[PDB]
Amino acid sequence: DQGGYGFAMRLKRRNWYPGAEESEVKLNESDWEATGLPTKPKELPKRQKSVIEKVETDGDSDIYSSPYLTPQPKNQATGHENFQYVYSGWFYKHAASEKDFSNKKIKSGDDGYIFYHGEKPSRQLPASGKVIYKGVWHFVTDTKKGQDFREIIQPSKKQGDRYSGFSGDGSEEYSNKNESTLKDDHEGYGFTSNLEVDFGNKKLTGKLIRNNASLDKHTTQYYSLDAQITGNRFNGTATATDKKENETKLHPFVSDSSSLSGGFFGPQGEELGFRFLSDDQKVAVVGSAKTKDKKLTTVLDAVELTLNDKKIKNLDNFSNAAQLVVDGIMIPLLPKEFTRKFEHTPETKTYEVEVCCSNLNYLKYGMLTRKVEQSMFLQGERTDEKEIPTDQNVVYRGSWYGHIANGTSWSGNASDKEGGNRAEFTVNFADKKITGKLTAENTFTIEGMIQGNGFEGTAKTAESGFDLDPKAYITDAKVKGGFYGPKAEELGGWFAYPGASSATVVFGAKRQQP
Amino acid sequence: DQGGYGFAMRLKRRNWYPGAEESEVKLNESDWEATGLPTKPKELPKRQKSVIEKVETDGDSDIYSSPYLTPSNAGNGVNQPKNQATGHENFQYVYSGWFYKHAASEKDFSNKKIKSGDDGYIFYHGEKPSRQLPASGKVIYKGVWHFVTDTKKGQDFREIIQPSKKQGDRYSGFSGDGSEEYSNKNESTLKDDHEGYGFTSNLEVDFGNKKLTGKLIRNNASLNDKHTTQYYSLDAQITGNRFNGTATATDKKENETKLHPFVSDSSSLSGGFFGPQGEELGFRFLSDDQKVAVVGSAKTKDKSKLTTVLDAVELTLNDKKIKNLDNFSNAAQLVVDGIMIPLLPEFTRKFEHTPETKTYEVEVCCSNLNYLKYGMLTRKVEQSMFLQGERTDEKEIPTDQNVVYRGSWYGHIANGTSWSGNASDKEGGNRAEFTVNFADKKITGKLTAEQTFTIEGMIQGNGFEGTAKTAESGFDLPKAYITDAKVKGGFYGPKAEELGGWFAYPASSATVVFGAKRQ
Ligand code: NA
């Protein structure tokens, strides 16, 4: 979707002051909150935790949270419990009532959040095969006067009416979360998720169930899931398994959702997080799942090349070339005209960014400066390896940002004109062969082999030295890159030297046509 | 208990008018209704049926009832459910079950009343309460049982009734609800450990020790390993043709959360035996927490020395004929024409009574008798004598070889003109005396008007039989003559503190009831 490390949704409490009563408080897409990057996924998300810390109590000040979270119920899919990258769950307080009679506000009930968050969003995934993910899921409901969800939460405290139904409520007493052993057909403890991810076809399906207390089949299914995978993200729908027919509907899971979204985390996407909001705005869900406890394709490139030390770091990215993720904050690259330039301060003081180009849509590259640090960056969404064209002669044209020196330093931005930085590449896909040239003043020569949706080769200053306007002699510099966008219209790469002349360069070119 | 042909309990519907809402409606002992004696036990009880007939509907007017019941005066759909204990299904004397309508909602805003849900009854009723039972042995009875619950806001019983319509909250949970979908009542074959279809009862009656035990279970839908669920065990003492005791909720746990209503014991199990030798029975109870009422019925296997537990007879004057009366093992409760006439509000007594034959006139004796009552009964005009008593257990029959009993008798005799004489304590009026040799199984005595009769007989178990005769000589009012009068009687109360009997004849007639007390 619009990408992020995580999302949280707060419980609602309904005003029941007589004469100024809200009959209902619905959930809204706008209610979703970003969590930010967690240092430790097992801990509560910091922004929302701080909110709850300040929530007033009167008799019980503790924060209660999902049992596997960092402060004897269980909530886990057996064989799939050792999360390292992604956590979902809930936390709350027995919040004091708001009793503001002269402003006509009375509110009572728990206050808290459901959430998921993760670290290390994936840049590679299995190339093929169907893989089973299991884990947990959580929910929070709207509030409506007279409403109860007695099938899921015993309504002695007006859960669903005065404050949201949620999966952490003390009266959620129909799951097996407190039992000591499992029935033969239980998937685990409490509310659990089961997803089948088809990396071959870039899609996934799943089921969200409750494992039922034993006091006849022991689970109940509330949703099935369907989603398309794009890069490290996925988007789709949730289908309510029991909606309204012969029943008056004793639970909140009665409407489909068209807003299922999530993403993969970890080295090869072995964990995932997701959320959705029901179309009738009655229920929000978050969840997490992982491969069983213990060949790849690359879906994106996102790198930072630091000048001062010529070093190259991987950046996080949510499979969106136009969204630059640095230091856990998200910097957009298009203003909701070749190249571009601007600065940005969140909430390092400010970020200065120069980005190219206007004609590129799956690939962005340029300059990044913190304040003072300076780096180049490149990020792109790789084309599916199965979409790599077979054409034997393909020309790409564009530019590049350059920083090089054997004595004094030369720096040159990218440009469309005139004798400024220019790049050209000819690719023989059939041969798995790639070559091209970068010129400043009319010089590097690059040979490489294509592998899947990526390439790898060398860049040399040739013979001998370059200019510095003193000869810089770079030869056998490792060059890595990729093809971005559908059907590989855009391509990009970078190189650092060494692995008395230095060099750091990002470049990107666009495909032509007869 | 207090005896009767049957009992019914109505479903509750909770008021949910906002602002005037009942959060709960509990069941009460006072909610039990007498059914009266059914002409045909397979039919619905008439009083309660009439109530349900008048219950308003708006879309579906049918009365739904237990599958083995007579639809009678009422229809169905998607229907072949069963509710039966296999091998024990051919009831003739006693039926239990339920009947109901999809009642219209009461929508009376102007009286702040909103009520919705089914309206109906559970019940059992029987005919021919037993005057004899097997003398000994343990006997298996099986059958069915039914329940109705209280109503409470937010409450559901999802383990027994799928709560889509707020069963247990807006209207009573009950065993006939359309959403009782977890029993096997609709299945076509039985698992090998099912006792039958739907909710069934299993009782072991120990006639030797005058007690019984039992189990009430559900036979579960097959949707490995066991296919029934037990909700109660039962324990009761038998007294005459009645039994009383307790029900014990099988799963009350402690910690709950209790998805069914059967969570509390009951100290009010009561029922009775029906049929020639008590081969069928009916029972009811109300849970101590007033959350559930149960009724049921059971019978010996579908197709033995007997003991007599009571005598209850009517001797009609005009035709000198003798009919058995129904009785619920209670000497002080006179049951005639299906209605119950109490006999205690001073020797003898007299009074009249009209139920709801115009009125009944009764003269009853005596004040010192507690397991035996006898006197005059008149309908309006018909006239009869009656006697009824609770027999002493044959095993309690004393061995004493010389025992005197003293009392009186009511007399009606004539060879020409008629002589009638009430019973009395004094003076030369009717007086009776008996000497009994239990060891000899021998009994004799005399009735005198002041002239007399003389009775002799032998003793079989807890009853006696023999003959009575005038002096002949003759009698008074002019003389009447009696010879070889057929005499029947019994011993009543613990260790036979009491005894009584009667005779009819058969140009002289005679009809006499008598009762005496031990000295
Ligand atoms: Na009755």
Termini separation of chain A (Å)? 35 Å
- The CATH architecture classification of the largest domain in chain A is Beta Barrel
| Number of helical regions of chain A | 1
Strand content of chain A: over 45%
Count of discrete domains of chain A? 3
Class of secondary structure makeup of chain A: mainly beta
Which value, in Å, is the CA radius of gyration of chain A? 27 Å
Oligomer: part of a larger assembly
CATH topology of the largest domain in chain A: Porin
Largest Cβ-defined interface: A-B, 16 and 14 residues
Spatial order of strands in the largest sheet of chain A: 11-14-15-16-17-18-19-20
Query: Which molecules are bound besides the chains?
Result: sodium ion
Approximate shape of chain A? elongated
Pfam families (chain B): TbpB_A, TbpB_B_D, TbpB_C
Region (Disordered) (chain B): 23-49, 62-85, 164-190
Subcellular location (chain B): Cell outer membrane; Cell surface
Organism (chain B): Neisseria meningitidis serogroup B
Question: Any key phrases for this structure?
Answer:
Lipocalin, mainly beta, part of a larger assembly, 514 residues, eight-stranded antiparallel beta barrel, Porin, binds sodium ion, 1 helix, 38 strands, 2 chains
Task: Describe the protein's topology.
This is part of a larger assembly, with two copies of chain A.
Chain A: E1 6-10, E2 24-25, E3 33-34, H1 46-54, E4 64-65, E5 76-77, E6 86-93, E7 98-100, E8 105-107, E9 111-118, E10 124-126, E11 130-141, E12 143-144, E13 188-189, E14 191-198, E15 203-211, E16 219-230, E17 233-240, E18 257-265, E19 271-277, E20 283-290, E21 296-298, E22 300-306, E23 311-314, E24 323-326, E25 329-332, E26 341-344, E27 351-356, E28 363-370, E29 373-381, E30 394-405, E31 409-412, E32 422-428, E33 433-439, E34 444-451, E35 454-460, E36 477-484, E37 490-497, E38 502-511
Antiparallel strand pairs in A: 1-3, 1-9, 2-12, 4-6, 5-13, 6-9, 7-8, 10-21, 11-14, 11-20, 14-15, 15-16, 16-17, 17-18, 18-19, 19-20, 22-23, 22-29, 24-25, 26-27, 27-28, 28-29, 30-31, 30-32, 30-38, 32-33, 33-34, 34-35, 35-36, 36-37, 37-38
Biased composition (Basic and acidic residues) (chain A): 40-49, 338-347
Region (Disordered) (chain A): 23-49, 156-182
Subcellular location (chain A): Cell outer membrane; Cell surface
